[PDB]
Write a protein that binds this ligand. Structure first.
Ligand SMILES: Nc1ncnc2c1ncn2[C@@H]1O[C@H](COP(=O)(O)OP(=O)(O)OP(=O)(O)O)[C@@H](O)[C@H]1O
Ligand SMILES: [Mg+2]
Lengths: 179, 501, 53, 479, 59, 145, 72, 245, 70
């Protein structure tokens, strides 16, 4: 994807990569996402009517308490100057996808009714890695009542590529007979 | 019809021998569904043109593989496709399942039966958009494709592998002419396919009913989209009809394809492309409108002997508004199609059905198409009508007609009567040869204009019944032999004497 | 006429034969649906042993 | 159970934002809990026309959006517009929504059917081409109607279109068992009032004991917003296809006027922002028309038959609106101004009326011959009018003294007394069979009735009545 | 043609029975699975599924 | 635009007896460009409005003042509007005028015609003269009768 | 917001306050003979009109049942 | 088009030859360019045409010119959509060509083949220092007759022939004969009509036209001129119509 | 969605945000297609000034937009 929100996030990651603050910058970006969740805080930055000069002063105070990275404080200042603070939320979310690309980590998300031990995951995370082509795999877990007793892992560029077996066997059987 | 006692064996069979193979499958999330076109986030390994299947069972063709999402041509109404629901990448790329079991079934744009007669079994898939035969893999059109209408098979002859346009105003007999051609292919091994784009559902049903009644649904597939059904299916329905035709083309069968109209495909593509906010051209039809039909009609070809000499004869049908053939669509299809058949509405309102405007109709492959009996017999005919266009001109101006002009003008009216035919009563090649011959020689000159059509019907019936040697000559030798010519005359003398009393 | 009318009556007779046959088949199907219940029960158990590993 | 908030109001077009899970699909109605001028709640009904993504739909209001506020609650009703159908609907003027606008209170109906419905399937259609017998001598002879087919009235006002419409409404109820449904698409309120009071005088709508009436009227006014004028074509259609599917009747659906429906759609498309198609019409014009015309069809149960008025813009039959409409039409009935000046009622022009259905394989050989002859005789008389003034009736040849006389008798025979006009003229109407029509024009064209006067054929129903009228005239003259 | 009607009929009915019957079996299977060993058999199937996936990946 | 005009135009019509029989007669004036009656605003306002009174400048220079092109002009209400006295008089007038519009082509050739045809042309021309009026000289109903 | 006047004086960032009412005009018998503008304020230079009732500008038209056939 | 052009250009440049470059149809080349332009996102300048229409057309056309080393003689058919020569694709092409041959549809409805509208077709070489004074003084005098006849048609369409003056009638008779003489059977078109085509040398053509204009052939009927090669053929054909009886 | 957000440019911007600078001397090519370049920078050009590309081409700065230069 290449949209304005994605474009900005990619720049932010590239500067971190150059300066070797990828771990350090990522923590700050995660820290920002908590900040901009709040309807009141986001609204203040986003709306055109509040004066830009006031926004910087408030932003500076926020940065100090937060203790953000020197570029990360710039990056928000750049967004504010160039009017794209209305799409901060899209930009922050976009950065996580870019950050995995730079490392070579890949997310997978694996779904069960029942919580599973690391050993099963270790096989899956190794399994997604070879199948992925990954340098590294980072695993995301979710709990679902609806399937049966299996699970489905999703991976790829997006969460596009899903390979599952739990409910799906039942569905396949239902289809199979009608043939 | 005893089902229930074997179901306990049948149900077990379905479970039996089931692999349950697990493979990675691409999936995506629906961002929005609008204007017949869905956008899907996800699917980082779809191919352009691949079928992506939604949760609802709707099938979509992936066409805009953008950098972050995929645009999908929703084949069908997107009315149940709810935003956020998942899609699945099939891996198959725009395919119609195709087999012999299609024949005699009415079908949807997506090739799922709509006649309510159960499933249709296909081993093999032909792509929906697949390359036309090249410049080497064709050969020249030389077989006839006998429509059974006299005005076509004598004067605008349609060969096998030819694209031949049927153009005219609404309600001028276009469907009937196309339908008549399909009816007349009973003997021959031709696998006529009838695509109904955008037409009335009731109208399509009558055509289908007519085929079953006349027994021509043993060799026809009827790909019917209808006026109700969404622009995307109408846009895509010919490609489905064409795909079915090819399965028989490259298997050395011969094929007829009837796209009824290609006018209503062009408006369903204009609806699709304007909803996508693509810049319109002339008459608001996009620039892709020529490449839309030309992909469709270039697939119709007489194949070479290295590929088995299959063929696909295309009769596309175009409606014109007030006989304007300078319109953007009919001028696009005339420049594709090898020659056209003008059905003028002036003749149709005057009771001249089939309303073939003969002056205005060309076949590019005119006479390599005809059989030898036809080329000889219809050589006379083609000229007499040429005389008679000019003798009907200034007929009331000179107005005291000498018998040089008058007998050629009385001959002409009778010649026009031969061209007349009743709907869905196609004639055999021998009958056409026999009928053309009788008219040209002046045999029918004595008869009253209202007596000509009742005579000829008797003479044909006389000849099938009393003189079957005439059919054996024209069907075997395929040449208007001297023995054959004499053999007809005796029936004409015998028949003429009988008719008088 | 007379042959034609006779043919029309024959067509009606064929429809009666065909109408009756379909009804008989439907009744037979209903009985079958009622019949072979064990297949149903055992048939149900059927998938179960093979559906999963 | 889904609640949304209006995101924006731009003219008659609303945008409603829903929570991410629960979400309406297209053509579902939305109800917008709004307030009135004095402050009481009044609710505007919408209809989702687009899904804009980011959990946001674009709905088109069926009422006025003056006073709607961003953020007001919108209750997704989970279905398209449910309209009351049934016995209760007869004799009631209805809105787009199914609300009664005639002041007789609530339709006490427990049955409602959505208006967006698929067409009857290809299996379910009926193939058998049946002539619809209206009981009018001009229509049954010269421009016959399909049962389950579409009809175009090319008439203005002052030509007695409304009386003709009413005769059909009345005749179907009597000859057959069916009903009729009038759908006034974007109808002027004055002519919505005049038609509604003409039905009460003519007894088509029974005011004293209602739901013994024969019509369910559906009125979309001109001052309704442009999304409300499209969907009155479908409200009338849905109410008419209850009587097909459930009561199994032979219905008449009158859409007045079919142009207007096309225009309204064009306006909503423009409001919605679509790129306009050739000649400024919506790009979905071939489909929105076909989504309506394909529900007007004859299934195995019953049949609805639409007699829908057609306006031809700029007198151009190749305009997209007329062109699109014409493909669907099966018979056209031209109501002539020139026949109302002569006084012939109904003023159906016999030469300009056409039909797809007047083919010998469809109507039989005998019916076709007579119809063709009548047109020819009528046609010759029209040509001869200039000549007769110049040469007079004596100077014409002996064949053309006759085809002038026969044409005059035929013209008079085509005119007939109507049931509806009994109040206005006093002479009793005559429902005339299709066989009595055909047998009547044989006796005029065969010349066996040459001796009768011309005003024995005028405003009589059956062929026998003209002879009976002729004899009485002779007796009166003798007296 | 009337006989062909019966031919088709014999097929539709057959298919319906097959399906309905299958459907039930499906119901029963679902029920049993809902009762089959949660962490024991559930785990086993998960592993199998995983194994299958792995196999697919290799291919 | 159609909605905007229709909303305004629909407001004015004749009320019932329970609301007092008040009325509201709207006479909109639309100016067509180069006689294009098929433009977007006059197509809208014609279908809203009941009648139309077409004014043509080819009659206005010809001397027929007011330039009402009566052949084209149409009134949906028609003879419901006229008084009883007017209906009797007007009915004869409309027919005579209709005949004269059929015979405008004969007016060059009136000499070579019989009396019935000639009288119709002769009467028609006088009938056209009745219609003419100077500006702001409105005739009372008795004067029109 | 569509201005009922020239917007030259309006300065960006200046606040605007919604009135709460929707487009009324004061209406009375005392208008007969007054040339007034679109907001029903006299422009003939003759002074204020005496008015006591307010009418909406966008009022709904009379319905189908509330009218009568034209006969006058 | 470029690929074909590149090959043609190489022959002229390296083999130093004279090249013919036939193209069917250059309108399609513009139309393909137009289709791709929409995908590219360029705003559409007129109708649906790509903004860089003149340039795309110009780039292809400019390369075709003959140089001192060789020569390209390109005969390229150009489609004209909806018979509209004011369409952007056809209109842009006119500037490039040295001689246009505008075929008409009205002449193909009558059946005059080739349906070359003789008034709309123009060439640069029709100049007296290029074609000589004899060819030039006829080709004007042919076009002066047809042009006069074209003006007459509005009047004749309603009244018909009879009204015309004797000068006008004489030109009309001559113009009609002249139109028919232009029609020619083709070697390629033997498969349609069956009549064998005729190669007409330039000298024969000039001579034939002089006779028609002169009037020595005023007594002959008009269909004696239709679809013959020489003027000698018309005379021979003329006798048969008269002889046959 | 708009030109001058090429993510060289944004990063250059982040690095120099606490700064003042005038890029008026030289401007960087963002896009080139079919006769037209979109130039980043050049805050000192005037409407109609000839600008010369690296290869050696002379172009004319018609649009002086706020992000880039046509
Ligand atoms: N050869 C014929 N003889 C007698 N009737 C005919 C003949 N051909 C067509 N008709 C009838 O004429 C009517 C119009 O014919 P048809 O539907 O074939 O025309 P069309 O061009 O298909 O028009 P549409 O655009 O409505 O499909 C039909 O009722 C048809 O059955
Ligand atoms: Mg048809």
């Amino acid at each position: 994807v290449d949209s304005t929100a994605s474009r900005y996030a990619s720049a932010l990651a590239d500067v971190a990569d150059v300066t070797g603050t990828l771990e350090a910058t990522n923590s700050d970006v995660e820290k920002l996402i908590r900040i901009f969740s709040e309807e009141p805080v986001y609204y203040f930055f986003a709306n055109p009517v509040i004066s830009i000069d006031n926004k910087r002063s408030v932003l500076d105070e926020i940065i100090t308490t937060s203790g953000l990275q020197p570029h990360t404080a710039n990056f928000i200042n750049i967004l504010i100057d160039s009017e794209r603070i209305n799409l901060v939320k899209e930009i922050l979310n976009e950065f996580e996808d870019v950050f995995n690309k730079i490392t070579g980590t890949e997310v997978a998300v694996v779904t069960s009714v029942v919580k599973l031990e690391n050993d099963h995951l270790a096989q899956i995370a190794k399994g997604v890695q070879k199948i992925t082509g990954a340098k590294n795999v980072r695993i995301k877990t979710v709990i679902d009542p609806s399937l049966v007793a299996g699970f489905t892992i999703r991976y790829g560029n997006e969460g596009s590529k899903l390979v599952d077996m739990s409910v799906k066997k039942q569905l396949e059987e239902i289809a199979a007979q009608l043939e | 019809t005893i089902r229930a006692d074997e179901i306990s064996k049948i149900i077990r069979e379905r479970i039996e021998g089931y692999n349950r193979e697990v493979k990675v499958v691409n999936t995506g999330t629906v961002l929005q569904v609008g204007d017949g076109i869905a956008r899907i986030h996800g699917l980082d390994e779809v191919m352009a043109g691949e079928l992506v299947e939604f949760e609802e069972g709707t099938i979509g063709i992936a066409l805009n593989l953008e950098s972050n999402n995929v645009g999908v041509v929703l084949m069908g109404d997107g009315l149940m496709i709810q935003e956020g629901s998942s899609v699945k990448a099939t891996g198959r790329i725009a395919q119609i399942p195709v087999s012999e079991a299609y024949l005699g079934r009415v079908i949807n744009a997506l090739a799922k039966p709509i006649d309510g007669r159960g499933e249709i079994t296909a081993s093999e898939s032909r792509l929906i958009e697949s390359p036309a035969p090249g410049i080497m893999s064709r050969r020249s059109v030389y077989e006839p494709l006998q429509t059974g209408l006299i005005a076509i098979d004598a004067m605008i002859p349609v060969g096998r592998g030819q694209r031949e346009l049927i153009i005219g105003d609404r309600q001028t007999g276009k469907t009937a002419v196309a339908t008549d051609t399909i009816l007349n292919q009973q003997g021959q091994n031709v696998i006529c396919v009838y695509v109904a784009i955008g037409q009335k559902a009731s109208s399509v049903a009558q055509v289908v009913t007519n085929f079953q009644e006349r027994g021509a649904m043993e060799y026809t597939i009827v790909v019917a989209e209808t006026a109700d059904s969404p622009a995307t299916l109408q846009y895509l329905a010919p490609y489905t009809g064409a795909a079915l035709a090819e399965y028989f083309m490259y298997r050395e069968r011969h094929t007829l394809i009837i796209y009824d109209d290609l006018s209503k495909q062009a408006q369903a593509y204009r609806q699709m492309s304007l909803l996508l906010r693509r810049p319109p051209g002339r008459e608001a039809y996009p620039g892709d409108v020529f490449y839309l039909h030309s992909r469709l009609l270039e697939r119709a070809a007489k194949l070479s002997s290295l590929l088995g000499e299959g063929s696909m004869t295309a009769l596309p049908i175009v409606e014109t508004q007030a006989g304007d053939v300078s319109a953007y669509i009919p001028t696009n299809v005339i420049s594709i199609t090898d020659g056209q058949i003008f059905l003028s509405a002036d003749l149709f309102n005057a009771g001249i059905r089939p309303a073939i405007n003969v002056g205005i109709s060309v076949s590019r492959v005119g006479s390599a198409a005809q059989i030898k009996a036809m080329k000889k017999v219809a050589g006379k005919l083609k000229l007499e009508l040429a005389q008679f266009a000019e003798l009907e001109a200034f007929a009331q101006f000179a107005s005291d007609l000498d018998k040089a002009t008058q007998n050629q003008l009385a001959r002409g009216q009778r010649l026009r009567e031969l061209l007349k035919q009743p709907q869905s009563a196609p004639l055999t090649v021998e009958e056409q040869v026999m009928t053309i011959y009788t008219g040209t020689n002046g045999y029918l000159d004595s008869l009253e204009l209202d007596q000509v059509r009742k005579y000829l019907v008797e003479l044909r019936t006389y000849v099938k019944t009393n003189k079957p040697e005439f059919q054996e000559i024209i069907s075997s030798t395929k040449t208007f032999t001297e023995e054959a010519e004499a053999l007809l005359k005796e029936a004409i003398q015998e028949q003429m004497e009988r008719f008088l009393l | 006429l007379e042959v034609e009318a006779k043919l029309a009556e024959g067509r009606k007779k064929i429809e009666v034969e065909l109408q009756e046959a379909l009804g008989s088949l439907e009744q037979q199907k209903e009985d079958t649906i009622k019949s072979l219940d064990s297949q149903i029960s055992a048939l149900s158990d059927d998938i179960v042993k093979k559906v999963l590993p | 159970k889904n609640l949304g908030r209006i995101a924006q109001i731009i003219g008659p077009v609303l945008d409603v934002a829903f929570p991410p899970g629960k979400m309406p699909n297209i053509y579902n109605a939305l109800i917008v809990k709004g307030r009135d001028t004095a402050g009481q709640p009044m609710n505007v009904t919408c209809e989702v026309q687009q899904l804009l993504g980011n959990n946001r739909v674009r709905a088109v209001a069926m009422s006025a959006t003056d006073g709607l506020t961003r953020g007001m609650e919108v209750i997704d009703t989970g279905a398209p517009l449910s309209v009351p159908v049934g016995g209760a609907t007869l004799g009631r003027i209805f809105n787009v929504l199914g609300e009664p606008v005639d002041n007789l209170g609530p339709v006490d109906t427990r049955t409602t059917s959505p208006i967006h419905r698929s067409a009857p399937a290809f299996t379910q259609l009926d193939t058998k081409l049946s002539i619809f017998e209206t009981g009018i001598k001009v229509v049954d002879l010269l421009a016959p109607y399909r049962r389950g087919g579409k009809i175009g009235l090319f008439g203005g006002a002052g030509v007695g279109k409304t009386v003709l419409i009413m005769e059909l409404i009345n005749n179907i109820a009597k000859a057959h068992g069916g009903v009729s449904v009038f759908g006034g698409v974007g109808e002027r309120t004055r002519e919505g009032n005049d038609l509604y009071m003409e039905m009460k005088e003519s007894g088509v709508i029974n005011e004293q004991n209602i739901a013994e009436s024969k019509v369910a009227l559906v009125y979309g006014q001109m001052n309704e917003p442009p999304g409300a004028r499209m969907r009155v074509g479908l409200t009338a259609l849905t109410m008419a296809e209850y009587f097909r599917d459930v009561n199994e009747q032979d219905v008449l659906l009158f859409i007045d006027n079919i142009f207007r429906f096309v225009q309204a759609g064009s306006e909503v498309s423009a409001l919605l922002g679509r790129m306009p198609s050739a000649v400024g019409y919506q790009p979905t014009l071939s489909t929105e028309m076909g989504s309506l015309q394909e529900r007007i069809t004859s299934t195995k149960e019953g049949s609805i038959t639409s007699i829908q008025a057609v306006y031809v813009p700029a007198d151009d039959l190749t305009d997209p609106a007329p062109a699109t409409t014409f493909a669907h039409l099966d018979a056209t009935t031209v109501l002539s101004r020139g026949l109302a000046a002569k006084g012939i009622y109904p003023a159906v022009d016999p030469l300009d009326s056409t039909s797809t259905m007047l083919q010998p394989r469809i109507v039989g050989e005998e019916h076709y011959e007579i119809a063709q002859r009548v047109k020819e005789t009528l046609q010759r008389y029209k040509e001869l009018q200039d000549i007769i003034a110049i040469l007079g009736l004596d100077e014409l040849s002996e064949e053309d003294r006759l085809t002038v006389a026969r044409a005059r008798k035929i013209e008079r025979f085509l005119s007939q007394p109507f049931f509806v006009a009994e109040v206005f003229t006093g002479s009793p109407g005559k429902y005339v069979g299709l066989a009595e029509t055909i047998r009547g024009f044989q006796l005029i064209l065969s010349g066996e009735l040459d001796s009768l006067p011309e005003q024995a054929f005028y405003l009589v129903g059956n062929i026998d009545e003209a002879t009976a009228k002729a004899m009485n005239l002779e007796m009166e003259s003798k007296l | 043609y009337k006989n062909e009607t019966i031919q088709f009929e014999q097929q539709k009915a057959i298919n319906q029975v097959r399906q309905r019957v299958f459907q039930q079996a499906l119901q029963g299977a679902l029920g049993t699975l809902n009762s089959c060993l949660n962490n024991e058999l559930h785990l086993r199937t998960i592993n199998a599924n995983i194994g299958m996936f792995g196999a697919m990946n290799e291919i």
